[PDB]
Amino acid sequence: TIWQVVFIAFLTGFLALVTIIGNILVIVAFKVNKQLKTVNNYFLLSLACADLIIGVISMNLFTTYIIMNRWALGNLACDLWLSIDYVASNASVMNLLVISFDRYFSITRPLTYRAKRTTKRAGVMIGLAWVISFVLWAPAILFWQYFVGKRTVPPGECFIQFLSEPTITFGTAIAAFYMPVTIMTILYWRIYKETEKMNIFEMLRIDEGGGSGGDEAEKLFNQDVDAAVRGILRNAKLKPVYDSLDAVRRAALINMVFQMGETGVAGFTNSLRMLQQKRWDEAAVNLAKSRWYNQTPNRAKRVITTFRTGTWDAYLIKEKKAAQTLSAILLAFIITWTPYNIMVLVNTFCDSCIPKTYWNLGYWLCYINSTVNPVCYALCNKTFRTTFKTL
Ligand SMILES: C[N+]1(C)[C@@H]2C[C@@H](OC(=O)C(O)(c3cccs3)c3cccs3)C[C@H]1[C@@H]1O[C@@H]12
């Protein structure tokens, strides 16, 4: 009847406006606060921009197609709606690829990449995704009818003419969804696996606020760490403590020797004793009452935390969060787009087997991805939370 039609129009109109105010909030929070305009978050802006176009155009023009069961906007409006709903949506998956390649390189190649992540290169990548998404889709959706010599799409319906054949449709699905998904899947489990992945050389890097040095500076950094270890083994006061310490805590001791020298650390007689006796809690409290904790409270708090827990938990906070954000993003994308692309896979090997009802549901399911991504920002990043509160 029409009782369900009104109910459908209400729900579709709900998620549409939630998408708009959910993404226009991210854009405003990006414009005002200049502290959220980083490299990774600059890519999230492209997602918000794309999802905004979806929430205000795509999700509203596809609602009408279900209610009226016909397309009453014209042939020009049909081809433009499809161009909009595809170019912006294809750029939305290119961003996820860039975001995934942005994090994987920061983990696999930390020496010659992290120091190259500028706002310029991050602004160019976004431009290339919007342009390439336009070139691959817009001339195909708009101009294909003229190349053929007629319009296949009958009056009262709306679909892409060059994707009329399920075989062509399937191949597009592989290159535009199945391939990007498998790539991001491989990357994610290499980023999540290589989280710790945490040696002394990068431990000092974080504490110094240090940066990636040249190839020669890494050989010099090794020669300095090895010498720092040898100096500890020579030190009659440090050697019995170092030998009793485990690999993670050994590095923390080397952190102090790098900073204060062998003799400097040797003065921590009571704390070094508590370390060898493995009284971590008491050693943490004692080390937190020295000059060292007041001269450099940040570097000390992490080294002391390392002593207390025996883990790298004080040097992985931001990188773990980076993966948890990407996790929520890829999970929201691979769950809302998979059913449609599965149906593209199925429809390739049979005729009348997938009802138009499921095609509309599978199509609308991809739309809610534009609604979840803004929530994923405030569900992980605590900086997006405070910004939305100010707005
Ligand atoms: C619901 N959508 C509006 C449509 C179908 C979905 O997208 C996808 O499943 C597909 O892999 C394909 C659909 C059909 C043949 S290949 C992509 C299309 C464009 C970029 S990736 C998600 C979005 C996107 O705009 C399309």
Curated annotation (Swiss-Prot):
Keywords: Cell membrane, Disulfide bond, Endoplasmic reticulum, G-protein coupled receptor, Glycoprotein, Membrane, Phosphoprotein, Postsynaptic cell membrane, Receptor, Synapse, Transducer, Transmembrane, Transmembrane helix. Residues 68-79, 144-166, 348-359 are extracellular. It is found in: Cell membrane; Postsynaptic cell membrane; Basolateral cell membrane; Endoplasmic reticulum membrane. The chain crosses the membrane at residues 5-28, 42-67, 80-101, 122-143, 167-189, 325-347, 360-379. It comes from the Eukaryota. Residues 29-41, 102-121 are cytoplasmic. Changing T172A: Strongly decreased affinity for acetylcholine. Disulfide bonds join C78-C158, C350-C353. GO terms for biological process: acetylcholine receptor signaling pathway; adenylate cyclase-inhibiting G protein-coupled acetylcholine receptor signaling pathway; calcium-mediated signaling; chemical synaptic transmission; G protein-coupled acetylcholine receptor signaling pathway; G protein-coupled receptor signaling pathway, coupled to cyclic nucleotide second messenger; ligand-gated ion channel signaling pathway; negative regulation of heart rate by acetylcholine. The keyword Transmembrane helix applies. The keyword Endoplasmic reticulum applies. Coiled coil: none annotated. Its main location: membrane. GO terms for molecular function: acetylcholine binding; G protein-coupled acetylcholine receptor activity; G protein-coupled acetylcholine receptor binding; quaternary ammonium group binding. Changing Y86A: Decreased affinity for acetylcholine. The muscarinic acetylcholine receptor mediates various cellular responses, including inhibition of adenylate cyclase, breakdown of phosphoinositides and modulation of potassium channels through the action of G proteins. Primary transducing effect is Pi turnover. Belongs to the G-protein coupled receptor 1 family. Muscarinic acetylcholine receptor subfamily. CHRM3 sub-subfamily. Homodimer; the dimers can form tetramers. Interacts with NALCN. Interacts with TMEM147. This is Muscarinic acetylcholine receptor M3. It comes from Rattus norvegicus. The gene is Chrm3. The chain holds residues 63 to 557 of 589 of the full protein.
